[PDB]
Amino acid sequence: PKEMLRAQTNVILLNVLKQGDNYVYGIIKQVKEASNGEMELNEATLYTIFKRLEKDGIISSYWGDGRRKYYRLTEIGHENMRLAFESWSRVDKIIENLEANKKS
Amino acid sequence: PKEMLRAQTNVILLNVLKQGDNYVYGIIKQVKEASNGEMELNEATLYTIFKRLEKDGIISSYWGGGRRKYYRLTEIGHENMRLAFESWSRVDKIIENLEANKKS
Ligand SMILES: COc1cccc2c1C(=O)c1c(O)c3c(c(O)c1C2=O)C[C@@](O)(C(C)=O)C[C@@H]3O[C@H]1C[C@H](N)[C@H](O)[C@H](C)O1
C-alpha cells in the first residue's frame, strides 16, 4: 500500500528529527543503521517529503558548519507528533477492547 | 487531520471484520462500545469506506430473524493485514534502534 510506505517513511523521518536536527546524508545513514541495511531511503523522496513538511510548517531548515543544510522539528512539529501518537494510542485501545469484547 | 482519521477508521473496521463477519449496524455498535462512546460511526461513512474496500477486494458482502447484509474480510484482506501489521512492527523496531543508536 504505497500510501502506507508514505506514512511509515514519514513516521521514521519525524522520529529522526525529534532525536535532533539533521541533514539528509545523516538521516539516510542513521535509518540504514537502525534498519540493519534493509531500508535505504532515496534523496529525491527525502527532498520531496521534506518540502511538504516545511510547506506545512512541521519542520524548518537551516544552514550549519562543513556547511550543510540542517532540518529541525518545529513546535507545531512536536505538537502534531504528540496528537498523532495519542490518537493512535486510542486506536490501539479500541482494537484491544474489540478483541477482549470478542472472548466475552 | 482527516487523512489520519480516515486511516484510523479503516484500521478499526478492518480489525472488527478480523474478529468476525458483521453487518453495518453491528459494526457501529461494537465500535461505540470498544470506544466507550467516543467513536460513533454513522452508516454513510461505513458504506463509503466499504465501497472502496470491496472494489479493492479487501472485503466482500453476502446476505444473512431479519435479513442483514454481512461483510467479510477476504483472503487478500487477511494477507494485507499481516503484511501491514508486520511492516509496522519493522518500523517500531527501527525507531527503537534509532533511539538506541542515539545513546550508544
Ligand atoms: C505512532 O503511531 C503512528 C503515528 C502516526 C501515524 C501512524 C501511526 C501508526 O501507528 C500507524 C499504524 O500503527 C498503522 C498504520 C498507520 O498508517 C499508522 C500511522 O499512519 C496503517 C494501518 O492503519 C493499516 C493496517 O492500514 C495499521 C498500522 O497499525 C498497526 C498498529 C496498530 N495499533 C494495530 O495493531 C494495527 C493492526 O497495526
Author numbering:
A (entry chain B): 5 to 69, 74 to 112
B (entry chain A): 5 to 68, 73 to 112
What does the paper say about this structure?
LmrR is a transcriptional repressor regulating the expression of the multidrug ABC transporter LmrCD. In the apo state, LmrR shows high affinity for the promotor region of LmrRCD. This affinity is reduced upon binding of a drug at its drug-binding site, enabling expression of the multidrug transporter.
To assess whether the Trp analogs influence the overall structure of LmrR and its drug-binding pocket, crystal structures were determined of LmrR with bound Dau for LmrR variants 5FW, 5,6diFW, and 5,6,7triFW. Although the crystal structures show generally good geometry, they all suffer from high crystallographic B-factors (average B-factors for protein atoms varying between ∼57 and ∼89 Å2), indicative of static disorder in the crystals. No major differences were observed in the backbone and side chain conformations around residues W67 and W96, compared to wild-type LmrR.19 Moreover, as shown in Figures 2 and S6, the binding mode of Dau to LmrR is not substantially affected by the presence of the fluorinated Trp analogs. Thus, we conclude that the different Dau binding affinities observed for the LmrR variants are not related to conformational changes of the protein or significantly altered ligand binding modes. Dau behaved less extreme, with the kd decreasing 6-fold.
